[PDB]
Design a protein around this ligand. Sequence first.
Ligand code: QNN
Ligand code: QNN
Ligand code: ZN
Ligand code: ZN
Ligand code: ZN
Ligand code: ZN
Lengths: 192, 189, 193, 192
Amino acid sequence: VPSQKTYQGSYGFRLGFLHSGTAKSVTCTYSPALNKMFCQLAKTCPVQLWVDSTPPPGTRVRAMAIYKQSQHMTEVVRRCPHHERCSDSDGLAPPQHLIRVEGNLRVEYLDDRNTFRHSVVVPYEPPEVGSDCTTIHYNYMCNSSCMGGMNRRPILTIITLEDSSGNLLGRNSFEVHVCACPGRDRRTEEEN
Amino acid sequence: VPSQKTYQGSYGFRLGFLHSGTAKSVTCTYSPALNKMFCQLAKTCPVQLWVDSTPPPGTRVRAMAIYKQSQHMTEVVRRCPHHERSDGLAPPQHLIRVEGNLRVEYLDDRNTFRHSVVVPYEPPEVGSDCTTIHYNYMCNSSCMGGMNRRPILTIITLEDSSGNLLGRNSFEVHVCACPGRDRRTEEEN
Amino acid sequence: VPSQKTYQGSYGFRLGFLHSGTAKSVTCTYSPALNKMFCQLAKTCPVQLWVDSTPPPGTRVRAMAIYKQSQHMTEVVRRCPHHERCSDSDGLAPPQHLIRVEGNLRVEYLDDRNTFRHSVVVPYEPPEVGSDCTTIHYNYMCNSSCMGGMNRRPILTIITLEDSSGNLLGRNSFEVHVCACPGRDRRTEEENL
Amino acid sequence: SVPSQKTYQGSYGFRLGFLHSGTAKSVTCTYSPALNKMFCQLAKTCPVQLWVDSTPPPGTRVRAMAIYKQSQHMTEVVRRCPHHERCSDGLAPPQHLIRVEGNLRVEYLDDRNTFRHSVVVPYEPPEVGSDCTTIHYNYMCNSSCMGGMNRRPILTIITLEDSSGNLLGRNSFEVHVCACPGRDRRTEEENL
Ligand SMILES: *C[C@H]1C(=O)C2CCN1CC2
Ligand SMILES: *C[C@H]1C(=O)C2CCN1CC2
Ligand SMILES: [Zn+2]
Ligand SMILES: [Zn+2]
Ligand SMILES: [Zn+2]
Ligand SMILES: [Zn+2]
């Protein structure tokens, strides 16, 4: 089972999210109280990278899903059978992978030859001028409800920072729920 | 610039404030003469919602700061970079927080870049006749590279669960060392 | 496990440090209360050598690190796999060594054949004309937060004065913390006391 | 380029107070209101009171530094004589004239650029009961120390600063370090 232990490490690595609120129209909204991202099928989910010091050119950013509940943690998070067999592929992403990256021509996907887990990796780039963080636009390609994929089981997204040689630099995670109305779900789940 | 114009609307929405006086020791005090709240950095600022009739379940209460001077009214009110650089829930750039409400929600406007903080409207307790919220102001009015002595207003909106405006009120805010003394002196002129 | 016992010996060997303070910007700062140096990755850490009389010609100054905690002490302190990667930088320093000396073209580095410990040695040279101590510029080449290296574990630098044959003439010791903002971390850690 | 001695109450009404100790033969430390002048013994406790109209925030710091009073000596750094300066309490540099007794959070600075000594402690508010914050300063040479101050008068400058080192308050007082404070105080007042 992949580690989900938070380490900031040498570059002071942590995640941030837009302060998007819960109006009906929002595409994607993070809940600080729940450390949980609410997003829509195949839509833009911006995840921010914040660092105290600049990892060198060659550094890479990996995303992997895992089931949160301990009785499922061993099972590979993958797309439901309906969504594997869509004409929805961008040509770079394997059709079985839940997590894509949008708008990055240097994206790399991995089926682990040993554990069989899926992941998606992009080069690390520093913040643009007049920004203080690096944004990756993720896409989740199934609904939390999909019969036979996740099937309403909670997942975590693990984000790892790694150097050009595979050495781990830092790690963070957040829960994610993929739904029709992210605004609505976040407001409701918070009222507990 | 966002709408600042007062309206009690359908539910009879008004703001009320504790009658705290100007003793040396007061945390926060309101001047009804000035419609101005004097308060201390990061400290409890009580604000009372008053309604003639009860809003529905899902009513939200939003607070936003704006510069009172017309030459600064289009500049976004934010924390100075000193104070920006922290309760886990608030963005470190936001001036106004809510204390004591684990359902608080913060907004960075995608197109205006204005900051606001919102909470569910809850009706008054059995024994209360109003709804209180604890605001905190997280910069001093004097903070260099922030407010920088420019006066602000707090706009308080009542909105329904779909974001339709139901009511709006506003007060000036001065964040200072000794609110007691600042209110008495300003009342003298 | 290397001896860390203080030893002034025949020449009255002691360590001093700059009185640098804790302002936000400072590159390096020593807490007298914590016998702890706070410093930045690959930046200058000045360590002063103070003697009562001048060691003999051919005298030498060694620096070695050990983990402080009892259950890490017999492990060798080294750079993380991330930072040990060969760089266009050094050319004198082995890429595994945590501790370098800067601005000294006679530096020597040692991987001990028996203990595998790392260390870095320079000739001892007396105080420059006028001045009362001898400054060495150490650089520490991983952060204390490096995953796979020190990994948030605490370390001491042991400083030894030795003769030309390697016999102990004196010893001193200090704790080291390698972080982004030494001034902020010293002031925060002292706010305990 | 000489530190400023200009009194500056600034934003919080920064004042100094001192004890009303009189001139009895046995006094270790006595302040002259007429002369704005402290009289004190080598290495003994010198209480100095911080008075404010508003409480400055935590992170506020209190610094002390000596300068020479006369203007042909003002660029010279005030330091201990070579006799006194010999190696101490183990928090204070041995060259430093001014120390703080009874504070494990004391910090000592040799300025990289001006070469000036100073000692700084956190500002604490007064006791929930008391009207002022006391610091116990100790002066570590006599005014008469051949090699150091060498009978030249000095001033102690007390500055209130923020966490970032920006100036909140400044006040100063002359200091004469002597064997018999009460006698030196009454003799110097004698002329008025
Ligand atoms: C980088 C690598 C090399 O190629 C030599 C210099 C240092 N390191 C080992 C030998
Ligand atoms: C000033 C005088 C005193 O009162 C005692 C200490 C020093 N001197 C002699 C005795
Ligand atoms: Zn699906
Ligand atoms: Zn501020
Ligand atoms: Zn490292
Ligand atoms: Zn002296």
